[PDB]
């Protein structure tokens, strides 16, 4: 069927190479996974050596890491906004390695609230939220959260994404072979690089 072989194409000089053996089993390819966004569906493929690979066909959740604070939470994927390889792969919503996607802010917003005790985003304050931000707190731990206030300032670019309700992430795992949609949250210079690319693309 599909072959990943070097004997079927031209030599360095440009001369045609005539094969000496037919297609081999170990020189095989398989159809692309083309992982979409939707309810979870993985098929397993038995591969060489008897091992397993996981074809993620539809995949909706995946855990992403906030590097600046080392907070890795499981998050739901919203949309695919940018892909460096092909503009056709963002018109369709397919997840491949190193494609810029949208993930919701809620798991990270909860962590920041319970770890710094500041409101981020949040342009009424519901009873569960107001109490964690104003709970009866002894002094011995008050200074603990007070010295944690010094580095509680996050990047400006991340702030308006938090009040919008969704972040920009980059997938690092290979979902068509691992079966996962893992990645990290964009920030810093890498964030402004992909923001102007998304902006100028719209025009």
């Amino acid at each position: 069927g599909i072959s990943r072989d070097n004997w079927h194409k031209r030599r360095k000089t440009g001369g045609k190479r005539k094969p000496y053996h037919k297609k081999r089993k170990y020189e095989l390819g398989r159809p692309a996974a083309n992982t979409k966004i939707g309810p979870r569906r993985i098929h397993t493929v038995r591969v060489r050596g008897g091992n397993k690979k996981y074809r993620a066909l539809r995949l909706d959740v995946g855990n992403f890491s906030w590097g600046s604070e080392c907070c890795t939470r499981k998050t739901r994927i919203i949309d695919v906004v940018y892909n460096a390889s092909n503009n056709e792969l963002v018109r369709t919503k397919t997840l491949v390695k190193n494609c810029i996607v949208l993930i919701d802010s809620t798991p990270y917003r909860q962590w920041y609230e319970s770890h710094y005790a500041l409101p981020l985003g949040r342009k009424k304050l519901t009873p569960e939220e107001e109490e964690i931000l104003n709970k009866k707190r002894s002094k011995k731990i008050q200074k603990k959260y007070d010295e944690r206030k010094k580095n509680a300032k996050i990047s400006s670019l991340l702030e308006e994404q938090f009040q919008q309700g969704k972040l920009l992430a980059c997938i690092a795992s290979r979902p068509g072979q691992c079966g996962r949609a893992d990645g990290y949250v964009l920030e810093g210079k890498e964030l402004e690089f992909y923001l102007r690319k998304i902006k100028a693309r719209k025009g």
Partner: protein
């Protein structure tokens, strides 16, 4: 300047997003008594296939050649010259092989006709299996 491609360009190891109130860069010595060029350390380029800054390891044979063409981008072609002995006539016979070599952009001043030292590596592309490890200017050609 550096970000001239569609995807963000960065070294995979350096985490550039530490919270603060110059980018540190990854580099290594490749061994075998080869000195890492200075502009690979204070430079700002990136390269997957640079021996001193990418994830390629030097193994196998260490060869040498003379530069012939520099028209491809971050890869050149050198020419190896040697003699081939033929037993019937007891004479030699000049033969040549020219080969594709990945030139890292740290070796920034390279012209046609100088001697470069190339070390075998992982197959980088269809016809490239070697990186440049050092460059020696030809006779004269200093001015």
């Amino acid at each position: 300047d550096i970000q001239t491609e569609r995807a963000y360009q960065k070294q995979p190891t350096i985490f550039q997003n530490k919270k603060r109130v110059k980018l540190p860069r990854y580099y290594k010595n490749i061994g075998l008594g080869f000195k890492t060029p200075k502009e690979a350390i204070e430079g700002t380029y990136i390269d997957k296939k640079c021996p001193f800054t990418g994830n390629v390891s030097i193994r196998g044979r260490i060869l040498s050649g003379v530069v012939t063409k520099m028209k491809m981008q971050r890869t050149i072609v050198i020419r190896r010259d040697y003699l081939h002995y033929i037993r019937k006539y007891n004479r030699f016979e000049k033969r040549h092989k020219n080969m594709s070599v990945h030139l890292s952009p740290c070796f920034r001043d390279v012209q046609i006709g100088d001697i470069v030292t190339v070390g075998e590596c992982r197959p980088l592309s269809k016809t490239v299996r070697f990186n440049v490890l050092k460059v020696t200017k030809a006779a004269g050609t200093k001015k």
